[PDB]
Design a protein around this nucleic acid. Structure first.
Lengths: 82, 552, 1320
DNA sequence: CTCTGAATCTCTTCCCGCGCGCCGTAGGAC
DNA sequence: GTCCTATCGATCTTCGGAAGAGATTCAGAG
């Protein structure tokens, strides 16, 4: 049901509340040393540490624990989990 | 906690906290995004109700659940309740160094001993055994000591037989209504797997041995051992704390043995001679020259402690029976002969034992009780007092007592057939006539039971007390009182409906004869009423006990 | 009389007197006939899944303007049979396929459909099936659903004294209980105001319903009250008098007219006054205005001129009102009859309490009180009211409900609709008001005429209906919103709700009892069990003496003896031997139709309600063999009361003395001589006996075994008559005689007997043959004895020779002394088959493996392991040995070590592996073994059938051109065109050749399918890769602590295994086996134990005489001469046997089965009297006293006075000590609180309860308590420092503080409470 | 006009050990 | 198929508990 003062008569919202909602309905940098998780791919949801900055390529490069080493692995930007 | 496979067992509080956190985070998100007043009010109401569910789930309009309507337990649920911490984990908690087993009667045990299986002893006294393996130097350390204990080496049994020497064990049948239900016993190793219990103690535990389990706890520290031996030992609890009544009241079989041994017969083998002392009597019996119930004159000697406390020996000739003279060899040196010169029964023996505790003391009393139990068992075995259908006696007049009494009811019916009586008066006359008939049947049956013995004393028949098996069982007070023999040999009598009305037509049969179908169906009313009464009252009694302990 | 061949091996002597006119019916039909009524389709759709569908389908969307309607359902065959399904662990079920016809109508046109889509029996769900033994297989686990007993739908009237306000008065309350819908209760207020409620909601005025039913106050008052008239003609307010309305009452005012005054003021009224008045034509009489003032008017009367209310319904009149209204023009006044004793104002009192006005007001009040927080609306209050009691979705009186309802209203017709009607509710209210006036009687709730039995085929139907209701709820919306064009009926529905509902019912319902397969008796007594618990019933903690106690109508329907005493006495009952369920669900029992003065052989079943209308003769009455009662007057029960009635007045007679008992009590001999308490204990214990290794027979039984063992479904029974051809203790093959052979079928019937298999109680259930090669059998004969059965007769235990005497106290008051001989003979040894499983899962770190290469293990334990890593079958193992070589990745030594204590032989290992993962070597070997066995079985079947078929073909070729040379020349298969004329013999050959080709293809397809099934990678369902099952056989013997019991409620643990020397021996040197206690016979009124024992002695004595006459080479004529005498002895017994017709072959055969004692039958209430026991003892050389003298083995002396000795049948109860002895030093500890674990399967310690704490406090023991509750259990640091000190030999504790208490503190600190310790 | 009665509502309570057996989040979107 | 969010946010939770006591509402009247 509706949300209002009483169940007999649910109430409208407001004059300005409608306008505000119609207004909105109309209207994070990878730091070196930061620990993130991969967002997608075979490495998604893993404990990784940033190793270098692939900034201007809209990319990323995060150390991972493979082969018992912190091997250098490069990923896309949308693989961040902050 | 995880379960079988890659899953973790559901936790109620975790889920309540999860609901609360999610709702509150949503409220924060909205207040950051400036949601309309109606939405934030609804979110605040939901958050309040979620905190309510976290705190005291069930005080809400309806408890939440994540299963087949099994409501989730809250914090207040974990605090109180029969499964709550207070009565589940604080007041009563599971203890290590304990076990349980099915008990059985060991008559050979002393009053202060109990037999325990070797396996249970080894599994309870493991650390003590380690404490010897190092002390004996037979084992290097725990690592090898446990291995040797596993090896059940024949030397390990010598270690157990040394460890268990004087270490009491607590035995605790449950339900332990009164303090006498927990007692300490000196253990002795037994080959089997059942716990050997003493006969005289089983009365205190109310322990019938028809598959009754019982638990053992091992007192570890020094003070615990001393406390067990000083406060909870079997021999330290011979009087009941509820009244001046012994808790070692002689068992059902022992009293039968003593009743059979001290009884006297009119004419018997070895009658009338003179015996120079109890020992000579015993020899006579064991040579078969005399009967146990034979009447004889034996020179008895008794000691009576003066007012100051020193025994005065007096010797005399006494007219008594061979059985009594034999039993007198067990009674301690402080009592008058008049206690054993009578056919002892569950009442008469009990006061006897009490008098011993009144005069001699605790230490003579315990050994006297053990000796009484031994003698009773031996001579009850010698008695061979079997029971058979030949022993249930129907008085011959019973058929007449029925044939008249029913006829009288007919007259009460005839008045009703003539309008000369009211409805209720007919009922309350018929039932009273039937009750009078039941009394007559019972009296004739009892008289016949006692009269069934008549014997010739060198001339002319003379009657005497009956050696009928059922009669000795009833008269000794072992089992089967008058109300039982009356149902076995008189008539079952009247019965009551579930609404309590007296049946106008009594169960005129007795269990020796066959009961018909309707009579048995009538009996089922009372049987099930009694069983349901027991099953329901066993709970209210316990609740009353809890209220009393928690008020006092 | 003719004796069957299974019967014609031991002709059990019978002591019955009455001729059994009706044999005991099939004991499990209670289950089967219900599920048969469930699964079977029926054009009378009722009583089945079709009923559930028609109750739902057709289903339509009103906005959709389109429907879908059920056409038909056909049930697919089960994928796996019972055996395979139990082995793999899946459920045994069948797939349900339902034809749905989706019709799409058209807008702007009549309902002429644009298109209809009939789906070809779309899949709907998997419904479990009832195996022929009457049990369902759900997860390999075998379950039985107990039939429930609950209040029948209808109307019930009740009242109580003291329980309500205690003020002497009783409050009468009526309830209407529909089969599916809302409860409706009418009740009287303490001030006689009548109100109503729904589902026990708040009290609402009763008349508001009639306002909801659109009745004016005028209509209601006319419906309920009588009219008394006054007129303003010929005089001021003369009264129309009904003299009968004046009776008993004192005439408190003057009434006189027409000469004689009938009754003056101040006097009562009698009948002669009524007669004088009736002669007087009292249609008008004089009464004072005061009497006219006390009346209350019946109708509204407005001022005719102004049109304003001058009088209204239920308005109380007065003198001035009378003058005014008559002046207004209403000269005929009508008032309500309101005699206090006779015509109470209860409805008017409700009018005085009613705050509502009319139908709109009625709906408003009903809506507000029904749904607080919901606003009323005219269109919506109807949507609530009609759905309450008039709409099918939420109201349905069942057929039984409507029948019971009309019976309660004394209607002439019982066939009525399920929804209530206005006159129906009016009649309910009228009956309630009449009961309030006292002109009727209230019903008894716990009366078998008000409680009816629901069985599996009804509860399952209801659950299926619930599933279908959910499915309809979804698919109505889907069809309303669906486009109806591309949709197909499979899209409309999904099986999940129906499958889930039925699965939950059959898997975890309160009534899906796990079967207690201890023995055949437990199975039977569990399948015919009746429960008052369950959904829609009561609960064990909310029932009182009223429902538990037995009832006079329980006679003949429910066993009053066999109830599980304890928490739920009287709530769980066992159905009587002969009782059967009526069509509506009530319990009916057969009675012999007594015609005038003869008891005819005509059985009519009477229910619980009809029985009160008759007078029923008890089955013990004698008849003169002409059917006439020998007794002139016979005891009979009429209305719960039982009393004497004259002959030829009785109307019916019970059919048998066993009509009152159940099977559990029926097996007990001499039940008549045992107090009902001991009978109950014996009946409860009889189903706990473990099947011994060599169970033989009971010497004294009641003849009920010959049915219980047959109907139990555990023995292999010959389906048809024939001759045995081959037996190998596994498969018995019978050459079924041609008289019952199908013309084309094989004509030879196998029987693959089941060998050692674990039961629900971990017991063995192997069946062993009893027939011999070449023996003829008839349909229904028992071929193979199951567990606890022998020669077709149920035999739970062994008949031990017992003596009643005290023996040094080793039999002290419950204990039992057992000779070493009985344990030397393996009398009581029994096999326990335990099942241990080693699972292996595809963990997150990788897949696990099963291998003999386990890490961190030496070859000592690998000795029992194979090259693959599983124990070799037949290796003897003890606790701690490794049975499976499992390994886990990332390595860990997780492997199955034998549980501590148990030891035995590994007799079976089944490894189920999820495919994809490779199969271990031993799994390959086991699978190949299974495949070889299956191929051998199929090949043997086909080859033996081919031998029989070719022999039949050659037999056909005997006549019709027999040519021996051309017949043995070629192989027998090349007989396609053998020389035979153009007749029908070649037609038979062609028919059988097509049959042989069909058998060939069937052999091929079955072999390939079986190979695929066996080779199939078994579905290890949740993330698991392989499981290894192991079965261990433990041959448990008898030891002190084990529990044995008789059939008479005698039970006890064996206290000593006495050696043979110490046992008493009689003058013949035979030692007794068991020494029981004598002091117990009286106290526990079970004197039966000492007639049976006596009889048992004689029962062996006859055998003792036969054995000699068999050991000594007596001539058969003499042997027969003796045995016949032993049989013809007794009264005019029902059983009569003439051994003459036995041809001496069956005489010797009977003796060989009789030399171990002639079995004797003693029916429950038609048993042997003592005079016959004495006669039988006299037949032997045994003493007529029954008691013998014994000699003590230790001293050679003779016991004084003889003792009772005989052969009592003893049973080993399933409570042996080795399953219960336990002790714990140190081990697992719980997590949340560090107290030790609890249990036996877990290494746990005993719980020290609050009562034990109180007892310790009763002594001064404080150190003991402190240790017990801190060091032993709770303080983690302390219990280690204690361990160290104990090893060091210091014996000192440091208690610290019990961790649990700290946990409590955190638990309180998690609230808004700051509770903390304090220093001072 | 609201003071002492009852009268009707909600909340809380119900012996104790033992031993098995089984059963144990759901729907729909990428 | 796996991985995510959430609770009949178009129902009807079971009438087959007694009881025992406070708490909360309602009468007859001072």
């Amino acid at each position: 049901g509706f949300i209002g003062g009483t169940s007999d008569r649910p109430a409208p919202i407001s004059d300005k509340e409608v306008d505000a909602i119609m207004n909105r309905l109309q209207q994070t940098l990878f730091e070196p040393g930061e620990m993130v998780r991969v967002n997608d791919g075979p490495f998604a949801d893993f404990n990784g540490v940033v190793e270098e900055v692939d900034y201007e390529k809209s990319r990323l490069k995060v150390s991972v624990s493979i082969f018992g080493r912190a091997t250098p692995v490069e990923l896309d930007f949308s693989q961040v989990e902050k | 906690v995880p379960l079988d496979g890659g899953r973790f067992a559901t936790s109620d509080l975790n889920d309540l906290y999860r609901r609360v956190i999610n709702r509150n985070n949503r409220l924060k998100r909205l207040l950051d995004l400036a949601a309309p007043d109606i939405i934030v009010r609804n979110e605040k109401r939901m958050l309040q109700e979620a905190v309510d569910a976290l705190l005291d789930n069930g005080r809400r309009g309806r408890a939440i659940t994540g299963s087949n309507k099994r409501p989730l337990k809250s914090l207040a649920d974990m605090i109180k309740g029969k499964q709550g911490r207070f009565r589940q984990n604080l007041l009563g908690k599971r203890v290590d160094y304990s076990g349980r087993s099915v008990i059985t009667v060991g008559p050979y045990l002393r009053l202060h001993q109990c037999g325990l299986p070797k396996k249970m002893a080894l599994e309870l006294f493991k650390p003590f055994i380690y404490g010897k393996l190092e002390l004996r130097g037979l084992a290097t350390t725990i690592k090898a000591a446990k291995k040797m204990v596993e090896r059940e080496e024949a030397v390990v049994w010598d270690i157990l037989d040394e460890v268990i020497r004087e270490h009491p064990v607590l035995l605790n049948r449950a339900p332990t209504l009164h303090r006498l239900g927990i007692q300490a016993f000196e253990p002795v190793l037994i080959e089997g797997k059942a716990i050997q219990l003493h006969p005289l103690v089983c009365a205190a535990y109310n322990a019938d041995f028809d598959g009754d389990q019982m638990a053992v706890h091992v007192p570890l520290t020094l003070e615990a051992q001393l406390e067990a031996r000083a406060l909870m030992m079997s021999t330290n609890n011979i009087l009941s704390p509820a009244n001046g009544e012994p808790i070692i009241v002689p068992s059902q079989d022992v009293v039968l043995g003593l009743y059979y041994m001290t009884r006297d017969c009119v004419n018997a083998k070895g009658e009338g001679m003179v015996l120079t002392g109890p020992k000579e009597a015993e020899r006579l019996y064991r040579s078969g020259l005399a009967s146990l119930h034979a009447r004889v004159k034996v020179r008895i000697t008794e000691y009576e402690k003066d007012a100051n406390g020193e025994l005065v020996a007096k010797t005399s000739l006494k007219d008594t029976t061979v059985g009594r003279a034999i039993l007198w060899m067990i009674v301690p040196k402080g009592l008058p002969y008049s206690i054993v010169n009578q056919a002892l029964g569950k009442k008469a023996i009990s006061k006897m034992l009490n008098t011993c505790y009144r005069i001699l003391g605790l230490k003579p009393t315990v050994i006297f009780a053990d000796q009484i139990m031994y003698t009773g068992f031996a001579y009850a075995a010698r008695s061979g007092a079997s029971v058979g259908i030949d022993d249930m006696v129907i008085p011959e007049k019973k058929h007449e007592i029925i044939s008249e009494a029913e006829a009288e009811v007919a007259e009460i019916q005839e008045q009703f057939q003539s309008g000369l009586v009211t409805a209720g008066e007919r009922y309350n006359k018929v039932i009273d006539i039937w009750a009078a008939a039941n009394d007559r049947v019972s009296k004739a049956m009892m008289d016949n039971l006692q009269t069934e013995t008549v014997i010739n004393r060198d001339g002319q028949e003379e009657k005497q007390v009956s050696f009928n098996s059922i009669y000795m069982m009833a008269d000794s007070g072992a089992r089967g009182s008058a109300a039982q023999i009356r149902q076995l040999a008189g008539m079952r009598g009247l019965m009551a409906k579930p609404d309590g009305s007296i049946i106008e037509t009594p169960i005129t049969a007795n269990f020796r004869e066959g009961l018909n179908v309707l009579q048995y169906f009538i009996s089922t009313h009372g049987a099930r009423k009694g069983l349901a009464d027991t099953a329901l009252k066993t709970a209210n009694s316990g609740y009353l006990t809890r209220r009393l302990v928690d008020v006092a | 009389m003719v004796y069957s061949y299974t019967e014609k091996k031991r002709i059990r002597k019978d002591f019955g007197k009455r001729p059994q006119v009706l044999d005991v019916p099939y004991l499990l039909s209670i289950q089967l006939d219900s599920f048969q009524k469930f699964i079977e389709q029926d054009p009378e759709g009722q009583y089945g899944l079709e009923a559930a569908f028609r109750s739902v389908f057709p289903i339509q969307s009103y906005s959709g303007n389109s429907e879908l309607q059920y056409v038909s359902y056909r049930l697919g065959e089960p994928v796996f049979d019972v055996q395979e399904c139990q082995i793999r662990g899946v459920t045994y079920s069948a797939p349900l396929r339902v034809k749905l016809r989706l019709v799409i109508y058209e807008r702007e046109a009549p309902e002429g459909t644009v298109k209809d889509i009939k789906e070809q029996e779309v899949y709907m769900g998997e419904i479990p099936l009832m195996t022929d033994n009457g049990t369902f297989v759900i997860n390999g686990t075998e379950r039985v659903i107990v039939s429930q007993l609950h209040r029948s739908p209808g109307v019930f009237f009740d009242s109580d004294k003291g329980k309500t306000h205690s003020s002497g008065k009783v409050l009468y309350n009526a309830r209407i209980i529909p089969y599916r819908g809302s409860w409706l209760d009418f009740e009287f207020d303490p001030k006689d105001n009548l109100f109503v409620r729904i589902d026990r909601r708040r009290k609402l005025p009763a008349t508001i319903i009639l306002r909801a039913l659109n009745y004016t106050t005028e209509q209601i008052l006319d419906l309920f009250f009588e009219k008394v008239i006054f007129e303003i003609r010929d005089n001021k307010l003369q009264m129309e008098l009904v003299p009968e309305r004046l009776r008993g009452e004192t005439a408190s005012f003057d009434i006189e007219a027409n000469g004689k005054v009938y009754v003056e003021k101040g006097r009562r009224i009698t009948a002669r006054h009524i007669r004088q008045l009736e002669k007087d034509d009292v249609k008008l009489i004089e009464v004072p205005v005061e009497y006219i003032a006390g009346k209350v008017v019946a109708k509204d009367y407005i001022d005719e001129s102004t049109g304003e209310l001058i009088c209204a319904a239920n308005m109380e009149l007065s003198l001035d009102l009378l003058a005014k209204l008559s002046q207004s023009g209403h000269k005929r006044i009508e008032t309500l009859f309101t005699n206090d004793l006779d015509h109470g104002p209860y409805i008017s009192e409700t009018l005085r309490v009613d705050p509502t006005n009319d139908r709109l007001s009625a709906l408003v009040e009903i809506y507000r009180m029904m749904r607080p927080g919901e606003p009323p609306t005219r269109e919506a209050a109807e949507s609530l009211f009609e759905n309450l009691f008039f709409s099918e979705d939420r109201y349905d009186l069942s057929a039984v409900g409507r029948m019971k309802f009309n019976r309660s209203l004394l209607r002439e017709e019982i066939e009525g609709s399920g929804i209530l009607s206005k006159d129906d509710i009016i009649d309910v209210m009228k009956k309630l008001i009449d009961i309030r006036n006292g002109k009727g009687e209230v019903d008894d709730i716990d009366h078998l005429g008000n409680r009816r039995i629901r069985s599996v085929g009804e509860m399952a139907e209801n659950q299926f209906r619930v599933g279908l209701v959910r499915v309809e709820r979804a698919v109505k919306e889907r069809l309303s919103l669906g486009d109806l064009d591309t949709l197909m009926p499979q899209d409309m529905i999904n099986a999940k709700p129906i499958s889930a509902a039925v699965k939950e019912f059959f898997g975890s319902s309160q009534l899906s009892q796990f079967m207690d397969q201890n023995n055949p008796l437990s199975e039977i007594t569990h399948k015919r069990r009746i429960s008052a618990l369950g959904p829609g019933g009561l609960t064990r903690e909310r029932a009182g003496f009223e429902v538990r106690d037995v009832h006079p109508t329980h006679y003949g329907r429910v066993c009053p003896i066999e109830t599980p005493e304890g928490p739920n006495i009287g709530l769980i009952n066992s159905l009587s031997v002969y009782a059967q369920t009526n069509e509506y669900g009530f319990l009916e029992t057969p009675y012999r139709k007594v015609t005038d003065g003869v008891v005819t052989d005509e059985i009519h079943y009477l229910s619980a309600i009809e029985e009160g209308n008759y007078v029923i003769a008890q089955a013990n009455s004698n008849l003169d063999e002409e059917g006439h009662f020998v007794e002139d007057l016979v005891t009979c029960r009429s209305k719960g009361e039982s009393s004497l009635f004259s002959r030829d007045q009785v109307d019916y007679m019970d059919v048998s003395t066993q009509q009152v008992v159940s099977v559990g009590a029926s097996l007990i001999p001499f039940l008549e001589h045992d107090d009902a308490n001991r009978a109950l204990m014996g009946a409860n214990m009889q189903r706990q006996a473990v099947p011994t290794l060599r169970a033989d027979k009971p010497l004294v039984g009641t003849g009920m075994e010959r049915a219980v063992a047959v109907d139990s479904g555990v023995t292999a029974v010959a389906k048809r008559g024939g001759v045995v051809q081959y037996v190998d203790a596994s498969r018995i093959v019978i050459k079924v005689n041609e008289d019952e052979m199908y013309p084309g079928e094989a004509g030879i019937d196998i029987y693959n007997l089941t060998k050692y298999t674990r039961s629900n109680q971990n017991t063995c259930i192997n069946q062993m043959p009893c027939v011999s090669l070449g023996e003829p059998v008839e349909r229904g004969d028992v071929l193979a004895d199951g567990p606890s059965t022998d020669l077709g007769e149920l035999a739970l235990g062994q008949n031990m020779r017992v003596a009643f005497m005290p023996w040094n106290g080793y039999n002290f008051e419950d204990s039992i002394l057992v000779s070493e001989r009985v344990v030397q003979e393996d009398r009581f040894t029994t096999i326990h088959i335990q099942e241990l499983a080693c699972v292996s899962r595809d963990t997150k770190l990788g897949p696990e493996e099963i291998t003999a290469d386990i890490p961190n293990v030496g070859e000592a334990a690998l000795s029992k392991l194979d090259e693959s890593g599983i124990v070799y079958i037949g290796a003897e193992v003890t606790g701690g040995d490794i049975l499976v070589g499992k390994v886990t990745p990332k390595v860990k030594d997780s492997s199955l070590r034998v549980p501590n204590g148990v030891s035995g032989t590994v007799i079976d290992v089944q490894v189920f592996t999820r495919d994809g993962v490779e199969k271990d070597k031993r799994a390959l070997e086991i699978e190949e073994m299974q495949l070889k066995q299956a191929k051998k079985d199929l090949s043997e079947e086909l080859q033996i059938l081919e031998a029989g078929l070719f022999s039949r073909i050659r037999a056909v070729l005997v006549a019709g051109g027999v040519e021996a040379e051309k017949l043995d020349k070629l192989p027998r298969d090349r007989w396609l065109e053998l020389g035979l004329t153009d007749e029908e013999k070649q037609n038979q050959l062609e028919q059988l050749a097509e049959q042989y080709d069909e058998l060939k293809h069937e052999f091929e397809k079955k072999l390939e399918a079986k190979r695929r099934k066996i080779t199939q990678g078994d579905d290890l369902a949740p993330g698991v890769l392989k499981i290894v099952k192991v079965y261990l056989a433990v041959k448990r013997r008898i030891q002190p602590g084990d529990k044995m019991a008789g059939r008479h409620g005698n039970k006890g643990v064996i206290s000593k295994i006495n050696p043979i020397e110490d046992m008493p021996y009689d003058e013949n040197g035979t030692p007794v086996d068991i020494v029981l206690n004598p002091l117990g016979v009286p106290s526990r009124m079970n004197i039966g134990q000492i007639l049976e024992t006596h009889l048992g002695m004689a029962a062996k004595g006859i055998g003792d005489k036969i054995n000699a006459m068999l050991k000594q080479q007596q001539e058969v004529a003499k042997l027969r001469e003796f045995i016949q005498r032993a049989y013809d002895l007794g009264a005019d017994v029902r059983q009569k046997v003439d051994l003459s017709t036995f041809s001496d072959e069956e005489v010797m055969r009977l003796a060989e089965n009789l030399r171990k004692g002639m079995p004797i039958a003693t029916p429950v209430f038609d048993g042997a009297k003592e005079a016959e026991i004495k006669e039988l003892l006299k037949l032997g050389d045994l003493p007529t006293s029954g008691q013998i003298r014994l000699y003590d083995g230790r001293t050679g002396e003779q016991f004084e006075r003889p003792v009772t000795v005989g052969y009592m049948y003893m049973l080993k109860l399933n409570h042996l000590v080795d399953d219960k002895m336990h002790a714990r030093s140190t081990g697992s500890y719980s997590l949340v609180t560090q107290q030790p674990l609890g249990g036996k399967a877990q290494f746990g310690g005993q719980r020290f309860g609050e009562m034990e704490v109180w007892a310790l406090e009763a002594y001064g023991a404080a150190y003991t308590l402190q240790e017990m509750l801190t060091v032993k259990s709770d303080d983690v640091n302390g219990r280690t420092k204690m361990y160290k000190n104990i090893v060091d030999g210091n014996h000192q504790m440091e208690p610290g503080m019990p961790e649990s208490f700290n946990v409590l503190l955190k638990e309180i600190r998690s609230l808004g409470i700051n509770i903390e310790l304090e220093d001072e």
